[PDB]
Design a protein around this nucleic acid. Structure first.
Ligand SMILES: [K+]
Ligand SMILES: [Mg+2]
Ligand SMILES: [Mg+2]
Ligand SMILES: [Mg+2]
Ligand SMILES: [Mg+2]
Ligand SMILES: [Mg+2]
Ligand SMILES: [Mg+2]
Ligand SMILES: [Mg+2]
Ligand SMILES: [Mg+2]
Ligand SMILES: [Mg+2]
Ligand SMILES: [Mg+2]
Ligand SMILES: [Mg+2]
Ligand SMILES: [Mg+2]
Ligand SMILES: [Mg+2]
Ligand SMILES: [Mg+2]
Ligand SMILES: [Mg+2]
Ligand SMILES: [Mg+2]
Ligand SMILES: [Mg+2]
Ligand SMILES: [Mg+2]
Ligand SMILES: [Mg+2]
Ligand SMILES: [Mg+2]
Ligand SMILES: [Mg+2]
Ligand SMILES: [Mg+2]
Ligand SMILES: [Mg+2]
Ligand SMILES: [Mg+2]
Ligand SMILES: [Mg+2]
Ligand SMILES: [Mg+2]
Ligand SMILES: [Mg+2]
Ligand SMILES: [Mg+2]
Ligand SMILES: [Mg+2]
Ligand SMILES: [Mg+2]
Ligand SMILES: [Mg+2]
Ligand SMILES: [Mg+2]
Ligand SMILES: [Mg+2]
Ligand SMILES: [Mg+2]
Ligand SMILES: [Mg+2]
Ligand SMILES: [Mg+2]
Ligand SMILES: [Mg+2]
Ligand SMILES: [Mg+2]
Ligand SMILES: [Mg+2]
Lengths: 58, 185, 159, 172, 183
RNA sequence: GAAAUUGUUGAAAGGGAAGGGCAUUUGAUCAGA
RNA sequence: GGAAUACUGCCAGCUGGGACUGAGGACUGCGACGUAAGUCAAGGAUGCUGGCAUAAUGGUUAUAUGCCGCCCGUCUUGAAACACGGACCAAGGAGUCUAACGUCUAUGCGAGUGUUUGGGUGUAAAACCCAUACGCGUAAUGAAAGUGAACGUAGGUUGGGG
RNA sequence: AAAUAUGUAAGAAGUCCUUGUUACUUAAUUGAACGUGGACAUUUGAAUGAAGAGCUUUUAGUGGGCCAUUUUUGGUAAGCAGAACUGGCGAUGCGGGAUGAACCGAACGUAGAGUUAAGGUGCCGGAAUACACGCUCAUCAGACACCACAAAAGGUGUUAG
RNA sequence: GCCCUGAAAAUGGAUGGCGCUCAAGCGUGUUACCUAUACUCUACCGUCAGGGUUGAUAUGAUGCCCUGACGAGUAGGCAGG
RNA sequence: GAGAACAGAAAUCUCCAGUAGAACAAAAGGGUAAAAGCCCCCUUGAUUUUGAUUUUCAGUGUGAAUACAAACCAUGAAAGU
RNA sequence: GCAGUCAAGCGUUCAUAGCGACAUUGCUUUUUGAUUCUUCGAUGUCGGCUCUUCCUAUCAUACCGAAGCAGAAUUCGGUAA
RNA sequence: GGUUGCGGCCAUAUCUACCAGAAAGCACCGUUUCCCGUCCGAUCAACUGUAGUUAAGCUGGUAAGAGCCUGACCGAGUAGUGUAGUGGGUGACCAUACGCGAAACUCAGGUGCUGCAAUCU
């Protein structure tokens, strides 16, 4: 008793019923894959900027 | 025949009335329905909408949250509006004097507010005092701090609190949770 | 059995552009890529390291990471009924700066110039692009261009 | 396609910077309306020259009326048509009072005798045969004899009623 | 325009009239068995029902849409009389997402007055001359719900091209006869 | 003291089933005003 | 050379015949005509008249006529099937209760909550009252020993209703 | 080396300008990234549309399919077997193809009137034994796609080339 | 091109039938006409949506009312009864 | 291809031509010429730590692979690898 | 399985009286396959006997055409079930 | 403008056969003590710039040159292809309608352009 093996029939219709959703872009994307040396220095630079701007409030 | 570009007879998906059968809640809804219709006050519209919300959509607002909102610059004299329950919070030791309008006050929250010298008023008293929502500050409790929420979106590499009855060693911590047993997450 | 390896069905995709085999010219390595740059992905079959998968050949993405010899590129891949974010680590031989936005950039520059000249001269902007419009009326002269009458030709074989 | 009109259609092969004032090619098209006439013009122009409707423009389209619509003419008509198994040129002769009437007759006759639909037929040429004895088809020549008369035997009258009381006659 | 044609003829030239800036498109095909790209184009032109018609401003961007939906629509160049009768008899405005008949100039002024369109004739003018606010006026116009043609379609079979003796495609000036029968 | 099933009486129809839908004719019967 | 006519198109040109519909229910609007009173075909039918006043209309029912109408249920890609169950009728006849739970919702109270194991009491399996515990929550994390949540207005930025 | 299909972009999260942080980087305030400050709303930067957009939870059934056009594999082929895209049937009545799951047309609340689709208009059968030009006579004539078949080869039959 | 030969199967039978021969056949063209649960207009039912109306004799604000669009359905879900 | 005792059509030597028509463990495809091939010299980056990423994909696992970081090394004059 | 077309050759000479290579077009469903649509809550599985009817691709009988038909015998073909 | 060093694009630059080249540069070229490498100072190393030469390299020019590059209403709106019909045809396949649109072929033109630094009759 053999059966059907594969088909993509109706798959695009199913996909488009709830649509192909664009991936909801955000400002400030994540830094997941960024070089860790750059991230370490970025953390130190941002901390320094925060301290400077905290003292800058006069 | 018509080639419909959208689902037919689709309900709005928003509550138009409280699910509750509370007669007093329905009276508040009637008052704020009148106000939202005949004032053009965005405050009145949002209060009417908030009066329909379910319990999980009206998380309690603590007096400490109210006090932080009053610590906001320029907001110290605004009447704080919570469409829901105001709860007490002993972690704060300095509650300011203020007017709070809420659906419900915990005994402790009311005691703290009155002791600080403010008043706890109902939403109809709020409506009489400020029919256009004048000088109000609407506060909402934390919705996504519910215990149920932390299990939502469970899956690999999501970090989303498995649904579990007993916790500890031997309870969903070995295979799929550490590299030493098969793999991690 | 079936075969779906990493480089399956790449026989012509990763070929070397006939009479353009051999060493990569130095401008490829002299290009500078910054986070946010838009790049087209086209694998160089002679550089087997840092190569993109065949799916990304011809895809355009945004650089999110810059390393010694490579960049990280953000692609939006259609998976199922939605797009998933993919992060590729591609050596610079497999990417080039995309010109998909240069027309927009020069349009922005020209629009700034046109707005400045408009606000210095008078009131007219017309800064939006317009599709090709229907042709206006024109008068076609027959001086030296008297219409020549053509007729369909009879069938013949010429074999 | 329908009762035909004849149009002159003049198209341009739109001017460029290198070639302003292009060569203004003209055709005589038999068609039922101007839309079909312009479609046919572009069809034959694409058969003849490197042009298409997207790269060209219709400069003019004008109905050509018969100069003498109430004088009987003999027409030689050269056509090229696709049969079921090949393409063939044929020359026919049609007696009619106008070119459009002759072309309508020709299309009817091609469809009747060779099952050639409109799409399969190209009118190469329609020309008045000015001098009789240059008419070379017998089915036209037989109508050019002197003092031509002929009867119409077996006249069939169309009855306006279901029943007749007379047992009709076919005299004429 | 008439004098320009006459003058070019007198000068031995040909007055090539300006290409038409406006088409009227009527969906002449039902809603079943439509391929997705033409289906989406018909939706974007608001022809979601058979005998629904809209005005389209002719550009390359919209001509490439008419090309895609050619086998399902009959379109052409509407005359002033066609536009006038269409708007007067079947003119409906989209107001608050509702189809409101254009029975008074106040409706048109209340919804299009910000664009300088104060009356039904101002609307018709903005349609026939494809003005600066053609997009807004045309979109304010609800898609026209035409009937079937009163004398029929003039052809035995609708679904071959007008050139091939059918009903669909560009029928450029005969769209007026068809739409007047359907209106 | 139901139904299946049956007798009698009455009414009706009935050229290889019967039953059904829409519509009206005809017969019978009946409410509303 | 001067016309006409055809064809096609336009008129916010005039007008005749036919059919279906009359929704709404004080006024409110936009207009037209009139100098103005006012009138109107202008935000949906009124006026006049006749017959009948009951089986006449209509309902129901049986029949006749025109046209249409395969046997339901089921499995199935596909059933009227030469696939299965069903001669008929009545009565019975199939997602229940429980333990422990997920989401959602309603309610009470709320950093707490749960009186009902038990005690008190009673008009006695009800209702009413209650101490100490205990459960869950208020802390996590680690295999464990163990350690255990404010640099800051409990942070910065972007958006964010009010 | 096409056509069709396909990635990206078409702005205020933008363009540019001044200068603060760093443990990164540079020969080097060199740069990198992130910031502080400043200028630029009618078309805020193609078209068309937008019963709105975004977001979340939770559950049913299903996980035998099949058919048509087109692309296409195995097979002589199959109402065969297997893929691609779309449209359908399944899950769907209605008008047409006599009949028929899939074809054509068209998708369906209850009615009235009008007009049509596909298909038809001798009679069955509603609707021209309409009009027009030809062709055909068959001692097996032919008579509408899917579709219910016919070929090579022949005929001073007849027609036109 | 049409027609004919080529052209043989089993119950009696199918351009659907009758029948049709300057067709009621074949090719082509032009009109008129017929009729779907489709299109247009109107009413009524329901659904959905947007609104008006707690200012009184107001007991039905889950009410009354205005406006627009929409209505196929197995498995299945939900709702009102 | 033109040459050189045995040496011939194939042994070794020489020049010329030689875009790869060779070789690169293996199937096939891709890639490669001062190399990725051939020969020689030095070596252990076939190492340590724990993450991210690509393919298959449920965006789970496994296998394989990519680019980094933090070390320790190899090689080279060095950039580098 | 049956039947065509072409005609290199056979047939003393002559392609086609009768045949007919190399090719090629078909028909039939009395072969066997191929398939798995119907039937597994069951359509009684070989053959024979018996009996009716149908088909024609005709063995005989009827009437014919052809012949490498003198007669006789025979062969090829037609209408014919 | 020539030349050198480093280059960018990587034949319009390559290839074949000839011709020419002033100045400088480059080059061939001379030598083997040292460092260095070879069977071989041929390559590689070092030294001289001295003994010699433009012969070669190199550069430029020439050729109805090969290749390559560019362009074309050249072929060709052809082949192909998206869409459509109850179009044709027994079929194989084909025509038409609305679009897109090659390659070969032919012809014409061309044969490196150029950055940085130094140098030169
Ligand atoms: K069985
Ligand atoms: Mg399966
Ligand atoms: Mg509907
Ligand atoms: Mg390639
Ligand atoms: Mg009519
Ligand atoms: Mg029709
Ligand atoms: Mg009894
Ligand atoms: Mg009984
Ligand atoms: Mg007229
Ligand atoms: Mg009324
Ligand atoms: Mg009655
Ligand atoms: Mg029947
Ligand atoms: Mg059944
Ligand atoms: Mg059966
Ligand atoms: Mg069974
Ligand atoms: Mg039984
Ligand atoms: Mg029962
Ligand atoms: Mg099923
Ligand atoms: Mg259907
Ligand atoms: Mg049939
Ligand atoms: Mg109806
Ligand atoms: Mg009739
Ligand atoms: Mg033949
Ligand atoms: Mg025949
Ligand atoms: Mg008939
Ligand atoms: Mg006919
Ligand atoms: Mg509502
Ligand atoms: Mg329904
Ligand atoms: Mg090397
Ligand atoms: Mg593997
Ligand atoms: Mg099967
Ligand atoms: Mg049985
Ligand atoms: Mg049995
Ligand atoms: Mg039996
Ligand atoms: Mg026989
Ligand atoms: Mg030497
Ligand atoms: Mg040296
Ligand atoms: Mg020399
Ligand atoms: Mg040459
Ligand atoms: Mg179709």
């Amino acid at each position: 008793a053999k059966s059907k093996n594969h088909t993509a029939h109706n798959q695009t219709r199913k996909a488009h019923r709830n649509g192909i959703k664009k991936p909801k872009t955000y400002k400030y994307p994540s830094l997941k894959g960024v070089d860790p040396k750059f991230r370490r220095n970025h953390k130190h630079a941002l901390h320094g900027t925060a301290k400077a701007l905290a003292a800058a409030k006069k | 025949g018509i080639d419909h570009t959208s689902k037919q007879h689709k309900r709005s998906g928003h509550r138009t009335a409280p699910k509750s059968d509370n007669v007093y809640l329905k009276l508040l809804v009637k008052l704020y329905t009148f106000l939202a219709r005949r004032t053009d006050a965005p405050f009145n519209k949002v209060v009417l909408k908030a009066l329909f919300l379910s319990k999980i959509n009206r998380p309690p607002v603590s007096v400490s949250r109210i006090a932080r909102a009053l610590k906001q610059e320029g907001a110290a004299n605004k009447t704080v509006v919570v469409v829901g329950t105001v709860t007490d919070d002993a972690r704060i030791f300095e509650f300011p004097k203020t007017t709070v309008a809420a659906l419900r006050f915990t005994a402790g929250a009311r005691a703290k507010i009155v002791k600080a010298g403010g008043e706890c008023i109902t939403l109809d008293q709020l409506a009489v005092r400020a029919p256009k929502g004048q000088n109000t500050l609407i506060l909402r409790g934390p919705r996504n701090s519910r215990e149920a929420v932390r299990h939502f979106g469970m899956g690999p590499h999501k970090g989303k609190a498995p649904r579990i009855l007993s916790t500890g060693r031997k309870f969903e911590r070995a295979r799929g949770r550490r590299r030493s047993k098969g793999f991690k997450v | 059995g079936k075969s779906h390896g990493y480089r399956s069905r790449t026989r012509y995709m990763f070929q070397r552009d006939f009479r353009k085999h051999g060493a990569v010219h130095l401008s490829t390595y002299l290009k500078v890529y910054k986070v946010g740059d838009i790049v087209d992905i086209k694998a160089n079959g002679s550089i087997q390291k840092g190569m993109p998968h065949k799916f990304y050949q011809g895809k355009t993405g945004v650089v999110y990471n810059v390393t010694k010899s490579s960049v990280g590129v953000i692609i939006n891949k259609m998976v199922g009924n939605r797009y998933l974010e993919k992060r590729l680590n591609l050596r610079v031989e497999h990417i080039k700066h995309s010109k998909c936005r240069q027309e927009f950039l020069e349009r922005v520059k020209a629009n700034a110039a046109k707005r400045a000249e408009a606000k210095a001269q008078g009131v007219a902007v017309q800064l939006k692009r317009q599709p090709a419009q229907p042709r206006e009326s024109r008068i076609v002269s027959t001086e030296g261009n008297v219409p020549q009458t053509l007729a369909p030709v009879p069938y013949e074989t010429f074999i | 396609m329908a009762h035909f009109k004849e149009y002159q259609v003049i198209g341009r092969r739109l001017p460029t910077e290198s070639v302003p004032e292009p060569k203004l090619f003209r055709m005589r098209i038999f068609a039922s309306n101007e839309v079909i006439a312009k479609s046919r013009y572009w069809y034959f122009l694409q058969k003849l020259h490197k042009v298409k409707k997207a790269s060209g423009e219709i400069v003019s389209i004008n109905q050509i009326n018969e100069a003498h619509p109430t004088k009987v003419k003999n027409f030689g008509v050269w056509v090229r048509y696709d049969s079921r198994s090949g393409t063939h040129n044929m020359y026919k002769e049609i007696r009619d009072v106008s070119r459009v009437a002759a072309v309508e007759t020709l299309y009817q006759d091609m469809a009747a005798r060779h099952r050639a639909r409109f799409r399969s037929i190209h009118i190469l040429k329609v020309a008045e045969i000015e001098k009789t004895a240059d008419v070379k088809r017998q089915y036209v020549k037989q109508f050019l004899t002197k003092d031509l008369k002929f009867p119409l035997p077996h006249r069939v009258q169309k009855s306006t009623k279901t029943f007749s009381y007379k047992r009709p006659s076919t005299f004429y | 325009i008439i004098q320009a044609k006459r003058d070019a003829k007198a000068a031995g030239s040909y007055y090539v009239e300006a290409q038409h800036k406006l088409v009227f498109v009527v969906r002449i095909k039902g809603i079943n068995k439509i391929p997705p790209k033409p289906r989406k184009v018909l939706q974007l032109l608001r022809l979601t029902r058979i005998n629904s018609g809209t005005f389209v401003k002719v550009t390359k961007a919209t001509l490439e849409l008419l090309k895609l939906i050619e086998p399902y629509v009959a379109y052409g160049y509407p005359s002033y009389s066609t536009i006038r009768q269409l708007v007067y008899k079947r003119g409906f405005g989209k107001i608050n997402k509702q189809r409101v008949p254009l029975s008074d100039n106040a409706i048109i002024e209340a919804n299009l007055g910000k664009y300088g369109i104060l009356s039904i004739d101002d609307l018709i003018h903005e349609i026939i001359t494809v003005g600066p606010h053609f997009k807004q006026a045309n979109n304010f116009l609800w898609p026209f719900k035409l009937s079937n043609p009163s004398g029929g379609w003039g052809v035995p079979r609708k679904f071959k091209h007008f050139i091939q003796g059918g009903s669909f495609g560009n029928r450029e000036e005969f769209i007026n006869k068809l739409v007047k029968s359907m209106n």
